[PDB]
Design a protein around this ligand. Structure first.
Ligand code: K
Ligand code: MG
Ligand code: MG
Ligand code: MG
Ligand code: MG
Ligand code: MG
Ligand code: MG
Lengths: 121, 216, 122, 34, 103
RNA sequence: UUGGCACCUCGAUGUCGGCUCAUCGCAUCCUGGGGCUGUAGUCGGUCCCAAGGGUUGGGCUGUUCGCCCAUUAAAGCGGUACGCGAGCUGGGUUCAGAACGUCGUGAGACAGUUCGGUCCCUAUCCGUCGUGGGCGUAGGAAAUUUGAGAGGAGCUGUCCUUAGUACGAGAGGACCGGGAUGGACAUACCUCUGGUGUACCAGUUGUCGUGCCAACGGCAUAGCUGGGUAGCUAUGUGUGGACGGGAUAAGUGCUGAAAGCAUCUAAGCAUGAAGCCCCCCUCAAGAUGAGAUUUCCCAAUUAUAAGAUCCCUCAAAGAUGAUGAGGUUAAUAGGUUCGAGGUGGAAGCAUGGUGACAUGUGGAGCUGACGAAUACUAAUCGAUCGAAGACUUAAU
């Protein structure tokens, strides 16, 4: 792995934790190529705690996932942590890893940057 | 003389008879085959062309070097082989021996013989003038602006050119180096390994070339 | 390691206690010295009453280091201080009685006179 | 550190032989969106 | 160390299964045999275990002692033939795995 | 060298030492050959051949140079804008201030000595180190190679045995030739010793966030401290210097004329130096004098064949290009399941202590870069270039 992304340690550890979260809520996001080859890994190590579901993994499924976002789906309220162990974990109980998918759109207008999609599967 | 080809694997040590330590590299050498014996009447020099590792056979939509091609495949089967990846010629060896299409066994190397090794170096990119050529760097206090740099390049309005063999930065790395007069420790036969006393060039999984020494 | 402007100590009964190194006896621009090596020193601190006063240049020999020595059997030995012993023209010691251990490498170094006298060889 | 001469009309244009741009790929018009 | 297992196979008949176990801070004795002539003797080193690294033939440790005021240390390979035997005689409790606060 | 002359430069040729780099010359400081003598032996002395390589760390004053301790095989003299400031310094050098002495009626000087005092420039052309695109080499492409030519390496010391024999008045001392162990220097590597290791492991203070339990996170040089995987590194780990030959300087000689004899050069002719070309390592056919083999591909302007490139996944490679590994008949990178090496015994319940604590379930649990196996994710889709053997003159 080992990409720095022109952002020092204290900044990269907080940019890769916002990407992992807001993705999960909407399951589909739009980023540059590099970043999504690094949440290619951070988020794949984060469902593998959700299948255990034990009391210890929730304690290490919080040291990277991000502060309690009081969601509101259809007439409800969730947390990103009582959605990851209840719902994604249950869809994905019988596959191995590899539940992300990158897709290449075109470049951007201003900075000439490759833009890609990333979702779950 | 004698010569075999193979890959560098790693590096470890062994204990001698007097409990002494002896440091060693670990050379793997399998699947060598002779492909063309030469002549003075044709080329002007006797030699032995040898190839080492096996690969796969011709394929239609072929877009690697894994799968061979027709000119290669028309050169393996000639001497009744498979397609060979690496190829080299050895020139200092007797040619009345070494019939064609055979194999070459490590067993032709005893333990305690003397050799010389030949391979590639490791890669350093665009590097300076004191890692490369290794020469003195300048003061860092007492009001100085010369730290890591090549100082002067020429003299004056006499010899206003700049001579050619001059030391400037650039690229050092994957060049061809040899090492003279190492020792053979031990020779397995099943795993097809030969051990050598000392460390020899290249990176892991590279390629190595082994041959008998000429010196005394 | 022991180079110029280095301060060893002394482990013999000859008055000189501390010294200062100013040379090493190789010659092709040599710039260090380990165990078994003849050097040149002075004194900076003595004991009142003895045979080697302060301000006297003398040759001397190592017996201990912080950097050890690489035995051919794949073994290493490093102490926790440094030390020196003061010698004469006849390739032998000024004083008589040795204090503190020494290193076995001094047998094949023609310093058998000092292993001939020392409590713990090691 | 300063130009001693003028740059002619040719030496300006002998230099831009390689100062062009390139073409995309061509998949059936469809993009090469691997 | 299963890389392709060709190095941990060759270096198989240079091991030895004679040697007791030990962690740091476990006093133990070390019966070397030292060769300085046609035949020579043993000369124990005793002390306390501060360091242990590695795996394979290249697995080492070292022990500390004080001897007439001075400290000394000797580090050894585990599988060499010099070392007749090792004799662990005491055991302790620590919280570190490299010990240098002993100086 | 101190000078003489005043031929270039005053619409600027802008600087004495020391630091970094290097390059030539011998009228040779050491090593290498020898002659000569009172060199008996050593130790020298003298002149002769020789430039391949080699040629030290520190104290006092500005110190160019000078004196001094300490080592060394030896610690060489000269050139190249008194080599190098668009590469560094500014003690020294003549700026403005102020003291102290010789001087002047005063403005001020001659400094005979001291203290304090702004260093401008984005490299166009040639030259130099490194790396690539385009045509060409009488059909087109993939691998292996010869080497006209060019560059590089080149040093030395002590012990002891040779062998106390040649020789030396005897003691002393080679030749011979055997190793053993080294200093400086030049190159590959990371198994050992050790240094770093900013997405790894424990410990630990302050303060914000959950009207607190602390189990957690954020910022405070990575908040500090103890350690440390892969990876690049030296102070660590291993090799190298060549011997050996072909002749050539001085210098040793033999036949041999000169002039009978003589005589080392005259017709002849063996000899002999670290020097010179050959032997050892590296790059090389744009070597337009464009080479040599091996196999593969073969037409109705004109499509296309062998065969490569675009393009996507990655490093054993890398400024970018390029080199290399692999593209669903697929183990390329990621992930998942197992191992290694590292840290040093979690959480949570359960016994023991009034208490803060320590024990046991369990060498526990977590683990970035190294190794293996496994098609769950994406290497999809599809496009573009691309040859059809001339002419004589011979032999067939
Ligand atoms: K100095
Ligand atoms: Mg400045
Ligand atoms: Mg694209
Ligand atoms: Mg004049
Ligand atoms: Mg003049
Ligand atoms: Mg005139
Ligand atoms: Mg804050």
């Amino acid at each position: 792995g080992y990409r720095k992304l022109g952002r020092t340690s204290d900044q990269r550890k907080a940019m890769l934790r916002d990407l992992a979260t807001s993705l999960i809520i909407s399951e589909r996001i739009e980023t540059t190529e590099a970043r999504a080859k690094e949440v290619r890994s951070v988020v794949e190590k984060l469902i593998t705690l959700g299948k255990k579901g034990d009391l210890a993994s929730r304690r290490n499924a919080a040291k990277t996932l991000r502060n309690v976002e009081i969601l509101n789906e259809d007439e409800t309220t969730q947390t990103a942590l009582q959605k990851l162990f209840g719902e994604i974990a249950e869809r994905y109980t019988e596959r191995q890893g590899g539940y992300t998918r990158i897709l290449k759109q075109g470049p951007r207008r201003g900075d000439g940057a490759e833009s890609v999609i990333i979702e779950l599967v | 003389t004698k010569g075999i080809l193979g890959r560098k694997i790693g590096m470890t040590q062994v204990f001698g008879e007097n409990g002494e330590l002896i440091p060693v590299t670990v050379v793997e050498a399998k699947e060598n085959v002779v492909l063309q014996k030469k002549t003075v009447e044709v080329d002007g020099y006797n030699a032995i062309q040898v190839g080492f590792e096996d690969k796969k056979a011709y394929k239609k939509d072929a877009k690697s070097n894994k799968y061979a091609n027709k000119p290669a495949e028309g050169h393996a089967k000639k001497a009744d082989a498979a397609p060979k990846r690496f190829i080299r010629e050895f020139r200092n060896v007797d040619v009345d021996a070494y019939e064609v299409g055979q194999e070459v066994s490590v067993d032709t190397f005893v333990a305690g013989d003397v050799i010389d090794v030949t391979g590639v170096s490791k890669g350093k990119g665009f590097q300076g003038a004191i890692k490369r050529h290794g020469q003195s760097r300048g003061p860092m206090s007492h009001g100085s602006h010369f730290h890591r740099a090549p100082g002067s390049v020429g003299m004056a309005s006499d010899a206003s050119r700049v001579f050619k063999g001059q030391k400037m930065p650039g690229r050092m790395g994957g060049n061809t180096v040899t090492v003279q007069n190492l020792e053979v420790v031990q020779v397995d036969t099943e795993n097809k390994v030969i051990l050598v006393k000392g460390n020899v060039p290249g990176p892991k999984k590279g390629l190595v070339e082994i041959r008998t020494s000429i010196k005394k | 390691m022991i180079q110029q402007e280095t301060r060893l100590k002394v482990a013999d009964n000859s008055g000189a206690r501390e010294v200062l190194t100013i040379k090493v006896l190789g010659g092709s621009g040599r710039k260090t010295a380990n165990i078994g090596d003849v050097i040149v020193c002075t004194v900076k601190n003595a004991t009142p009453g003895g045979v080697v006063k302060k301000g006297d240049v003398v040759k001397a020999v190592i017996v201990r280091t912080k950097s050890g020595v690489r035995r051919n059997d794949g073994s290493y030995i490093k102490f926790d201080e440094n030390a020196c012993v003061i010698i004469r023209d006849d390739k032998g010691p000024r004083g008589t009685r040795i204090f503190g251990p020494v290193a076995r490498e001094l047998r094949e170094g023609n310093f058998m006179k000092i292993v001939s006298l020392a409590p713990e060889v090691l | 550190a300063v130009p001693k001469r003028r740059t002619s009309k040719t030496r300006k244009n002998k230099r831009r032989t390689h100062f062009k741009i390139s073409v995309p790929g061509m998949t059936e018009e469809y993009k090469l969106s691997h | 160390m299963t890389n392709h297992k060709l190095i941990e196979a060759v270096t198989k008949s240079q091991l030895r299964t004679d040697l007791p176990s030990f962690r740091p801070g476990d006093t133990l004795r070390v019966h070397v045999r030292i060769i300085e002539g046609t035949r020579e003797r043993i000369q124990v080193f005793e002390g306390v275990v501060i360091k242990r690294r590695g795996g394979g033939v290249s697995e080492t440790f070292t022990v500390r002692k004080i001897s007439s005021g001075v400290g000394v240390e000797r580090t050894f390979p585990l599988h060499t033939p010099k070392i007749e035997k090792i004799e662990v005689k005491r055991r302790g409790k620590v919280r570190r795995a490299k010990l240098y606060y002993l100086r």
